């Protein structure tokens, strides 16, 4: 039976491939060739944030476009005021091997975790004024690779045990488990309406998950190696992924196909982070060459570079309003461009 | 009248920055070690004789060491291995000897050594279960490592008294199998410090100390151009 079930799976894969070919009347690059190019983009560093000792693994902007949370390998989270470069909080961690952090959409909570397989949720606004651990969520068997906040009472995490999870923070129990990847899950991205999310994994694949049902809605393939970063398009009907094959790809959730490839002959390094600008016209990606390339998301030409780090760029983000871009790297410096 | 908020913010930095300075003092004076080993490796005997990750602290001659042992992580190492790219050393424990586990250990050492992010990390290598190797040999390697049939003990070998020359040949053959990889790939940026240890041996606690010292010394010596 096992060979016959495998043959059935291959027949379904062939039907999916043929159904996808049937919809490919034209490529994106054959439509946007009549669109004026963005031209040269020259961003400049406005602020540099110093204070971390170890390499920075995670950074996340708050919803007011003014505060940042960053996490280093020392065992610290620092809340920063990007405008005045002043620090607000400096939270010591139970363990130093933290790989991700997230800022709550309300600004009340900070989440983090890493090789301890526990997601720690800190309450930033307490009656004493001191930052305290409000929850430690445990159940994942592998390292915790990404955390995202849906609301004050719900958090979405991913771990190195090929499973994503939806947690109810107040009760502390896991409520939904999302399985189906075969490699470690590396990055999550939430839809603007937080009903769907997309998960990239060390399988050269990404999955579109329905948050409410617990079902995997779509599987996207096309990358040749492990996927390191994923980011939803501002519209919410497409996402961009970056992988270890030095290629970035734009996928469309409505056509269930790869839509565009961003690559260059002189790039042989992986893509640590991916993010979009407010309008969705620019795609920004951090590489292992200690820099960031700004790509024209509709043309696949390079618009510009962000040079100014001396070690691996580890994290990248864009403000909700769009006024600035923040990056962090393994040299323990967070820089803001504008 | 809004200056009262701005003034408050400066006060926060003074409290935070001073605390960060204190933390920096602790951070740089603490030596972090990563502990890896084989499925049958006596990693427990390595910890006892000294969730997803376990932490052990040591103070050896007023020097603070922080050893991290990888807990219940997935067997796929290529992603969390990158995190440990700034530790003082990787301690790799291999038991000598049912698959060819030693070949798996050689393949893992080779992968760790040639990793682009681990090019500056020295490796303290413990070869464990020497008495089981001694008993097995004195009671076969050519069926896994044919070149052992033509291997001779180096003239500068310093075996312990009482060992059967076949046991010394086996130990030095395996050590040389690891050292050939170490020498072939290294470019003076990092070195391997292999040791022959028993399942029960407390002296291992100093072997790490001295090895860490040597690492730092030659690092600085490399920088001053005196090496």
């Amino acid at each position, epitope marked *: 039976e096992l060979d016959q079930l*495998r043959q059935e799976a291959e027949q379904l894969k062939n039907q999916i491939r043929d159904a996808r070919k049937a919809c490919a009347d034209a490529t994106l690059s054959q439509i946007t060739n009549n669109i004026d190019p963005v031209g040269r983009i020259q961003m400049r560093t406005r602020r540099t944030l110093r204070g971390h000792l170890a390499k920075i693994y995670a950074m996340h902007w708050g919803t007011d476009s003014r505060l940042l949370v960053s996490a280093s390998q020392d065992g610290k989270l620092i809340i920063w005021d990007s405008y005045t470069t002043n620090k607000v909080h400096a939270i010591p961690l139970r363990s130093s091997w933290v790989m991700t952090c997230a800022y709550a959409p309300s600004g009340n909570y900070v989440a983090c975790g890493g090789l301890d397989n526990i997601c720690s949720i800190y309450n930033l606004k307490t009656r004493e004024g001191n930052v305290r651990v409000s929850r430690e969520l445990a159940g994942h068997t592998g390292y915790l690779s990404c955390c995202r906040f849906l609301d004050d009472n719900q958090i979405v995490t991913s771990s190195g045990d090929t499973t994503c999870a939806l947690w109810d923070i107040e009760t502390g129990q896991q409520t939904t488990t999302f399985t189906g990847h*075969t*490699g470690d899950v590396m990055s999550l991205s939430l839809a603007p309406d937080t009903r769907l999310f997309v998960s990239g994994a*060390c*399988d*050269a694949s990404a999955k579109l998950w329905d948050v409410r049902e617990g079902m995997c809605r779509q599987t996207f*393939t*096309g990358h*040749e*190696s*492990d996927i390191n970063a994923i980011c939803f398009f501002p519209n919410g009907n497409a996402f961009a992924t970056g992988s*270890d*094959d*030095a290629t970035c790809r734009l996928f469309d959730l409505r056509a269930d196909q790869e839509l565009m490839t961003y690559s260059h002959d002189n790039i*042989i390094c*992986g893509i640590t982070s991916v993010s979009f600008s407010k309008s969705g016209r620019l795609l920004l990606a951090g590489y292992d060459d200690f820099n960031c390339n700004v790509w024209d998301a509709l043309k696949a030409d390079r618009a510009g570079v962000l040079a100014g780090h001396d070690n691996r760029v580890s994290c990248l983000g864009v403000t909700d309003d769009g006024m600035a871009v923040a990056t962090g790297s393994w040299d323990s410096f967070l820089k803001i461009w504008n | 009248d809004q200056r009262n908020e701005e003034k408050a913010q400066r006060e926060a930095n003074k409290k935070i920055e001073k605390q960060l300075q204190k933390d920096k003092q602790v951070y740089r004076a603490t030596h972090r070690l990563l502990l890896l080993g084989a499925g049958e490796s006596g990693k427990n005997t390595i910890v006892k004789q000294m969730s997803g990750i376990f932490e052990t602290k040591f103070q050896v001659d007023k020097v603070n060491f922080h050893m991290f042992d990888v807990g219940a992580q*997935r*067997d*796929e*190492r*290529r992603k969390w291995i990158q995190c440990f790219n700034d530790v003082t050393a990787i301690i790799f424990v291999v038991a000598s000897s*049912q*698959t*060819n586990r030693l*070949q*798996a250990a050689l*393949k*893992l050492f*080779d*992968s*760790i050594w*040639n*990793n*682009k992010w681990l090019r500056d990390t020295s490796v303290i290598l413990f070869l464990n279960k020497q008495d089981l190797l001694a008993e097995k040999v004195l009671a076969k390697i050519e*069926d*896994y*490592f*044919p*070149e052992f049939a033509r291997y001779t003990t180096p003239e500068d070998a310093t075996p312990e008294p009482g060992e059967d020359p076949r046991v010394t040949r086996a130990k030095y053959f395996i050590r040389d199998e690891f050292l050939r990889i170490s020498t072939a790939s290294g470019d003076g940026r990092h070195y391997c410090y292999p040791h022959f240890t028993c399942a029960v041996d407390t002296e291992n606690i100093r072997r790490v100390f001295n090895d860490c010292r040597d690492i730092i010394q030659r690092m600085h010596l490399r920088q001053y151009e005196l090496l």
Partner: nanobody, 126 residues
Framework: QVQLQESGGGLVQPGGSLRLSCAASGFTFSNYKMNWVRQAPGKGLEWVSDISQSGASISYTGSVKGRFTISRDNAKNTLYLQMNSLKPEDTAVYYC?????????????????????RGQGTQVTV
């Protein structure tokens, strides 16, 4: 989507030989190191052979030196294994495994847990 499909298996008497093959798709073949690994009926996966991107450096486990050879053809995307002078100990499921990243020389591919860039394998009974 990337796939590896082995071929050339079968049953032979002790002392015989086989030529195994492996067809690759979905990735640039010439940029990756390729491996052959075996699964014994009662033992965990064991690494067998490793050929570099160019074929300039070929490594074998000691138990297969002088009996097995490997090669690759980057114009056909095919990885081969010549299995000569076989013994009962060589009965196993053979798989072709790709190193996870291009342009590198470090590989972690004999994991018991599902490894993504591995084929289904072919049974070589002797």
């Amino acid at each position: 989507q990337v796939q590896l499909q082995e071929s050339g298996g079968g049953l032979v008497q002790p002392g015989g030989s086989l030529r195994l093959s492996c067809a690759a798709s979905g990735f640039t073949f010439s940029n990756y190191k390729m491996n052959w690994v075996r699964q014994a009926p009662g033992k965990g996966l064991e690494w067998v052979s490793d050929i570099s991107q160019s074929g300039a450096s070929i490594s074998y486990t000691g138990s297969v030196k002088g009996r097995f050879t490997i090669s690759r053809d980057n114009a056909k995307n095919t990885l081969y294994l010549q299995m000569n002078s076989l013994k009962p100990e060589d009965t196993a499921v053979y798989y072709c495994a790709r190193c996870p990243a291009p342009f590198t020389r470090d590989c972690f591919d004999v994991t018991s847990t599902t490894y993504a860039y591995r084929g289904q394998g072919t049974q070589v009974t002797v």
